[PDB]
Amino acid sequence: TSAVQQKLAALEKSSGGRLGVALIDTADNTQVLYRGDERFPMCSTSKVMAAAAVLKQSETQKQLLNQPVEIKPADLVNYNPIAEKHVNGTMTLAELSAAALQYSDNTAMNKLIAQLGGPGGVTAFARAIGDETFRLDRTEPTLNTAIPGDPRDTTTPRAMAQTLRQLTLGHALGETQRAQLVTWLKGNTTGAASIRAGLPTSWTAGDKTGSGDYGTTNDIAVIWPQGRAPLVLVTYFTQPQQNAESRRDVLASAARIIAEGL
């Protein structure tokens, strides 16, 4: 349809995979979508919803984020850069939230999921804020199997962009909580090669990346371009073979097409 959508099609064509993009420009609330209503495995981008759900709980429990949580040797999963330092000790929910969002610590995510009563608790929060698409079905690390055609642990680009806007720029969360989420996202350590690699350096942003089997490579971001209203951008990418390599460069390419199209 659009020129931007045509460029994204061309990128996808030589990418060797399936690309999903959703942009919301809050300057005018317009949207640009590519496979915007197709489902994609969220992988680590799902951590944003879990952290936000705990932030929502903290609105009625002022000391919740300071609540200690025991980390046991058995809790360690496949990637736990922060939690492994606290085995046989504790981490507060604020620490687990920061670890999950900024380092993609999987043990930390599992603690957030447990605090919400299981994967379904994350889905329940999504529904409460108006997201009828998002679904979390499993814990770390199996929520990242990313099997083609599998509806578990998926969402669509359109749905995730709308929810990320509501969480970071809208009123899904209380003012203090919304600010805390944005602060964590802006402090992410894993996104320089993804959406942000395709944006002008002056533009500041916060994001959450994701990687899974099938060469799944994702990123969701809130962007503050120089001189204009913020943008919310989601880029999902998945490939045909289970052992496919990550392609963060495809996400950066998509982001560049979006930026040049503004």
TrEMBL record:
* Catalytic reaction annotation: a beta-lactam + H2O = a substituted beta-amino acid
Residues covered by the Beta-lactamase class A catalytic domain: 20-235
Tell me the Pfam families matching this sequence: Beta-lactamase2 (PF13354)
Q: Which domain of life is it from?
A: Bacteria
The record's PROSITE patterns line, in alphabetical order, gives:
BETA_LACTAMASE_A (PS00146)
Major enzyme class:
hydrolase
What does the record give as EC number? Answer: 3.5.2.6
GO MF terms listed in the record are: beta-lactamase activity
Keywords linked to the UniProt accession: Antibiotic resistance, Hydrolase, Plasmid, Pyrrolidone carboxylic acid, Signal
* InterPro entries (alphabetical): Beta-lactam/transpept-like, Beta-lactam_cat, Beta-lactam_class-A, Beta-lactam_class-A_AS, Cefotaximase
Q: Name one GO biological process term.
A: response to antibiotic
Q: Which Gene3D superfamilies match?
A: DD-peptidase/beta-lactamase superfamily
Q: Which SUPFAM superfamilies does the record cross-reference, listed alphabetically?
A: beta-lactamase/transpeptidase-like
Checking PANTHER family in the record gives:
BETA-LACTAMASE, BETA-LACTAMASE-TYPE TRANSPEPTIDASE FOLD CONTAINING PROTEIN
The UniProt similarity line reads:
Belongs to the class-A beta-lactamase family.
Q: Provide the protein name.
A: Beta-lactamase
What species does this protein belong to? Escherichia coli
Provide the organism lineage as a comma list: Bacteria, Pseudomonadati, Pseudomonadota, Gammaproteobacteria, Enterobacterales
Gene name, per UniProt, is blaCTX-M-9a
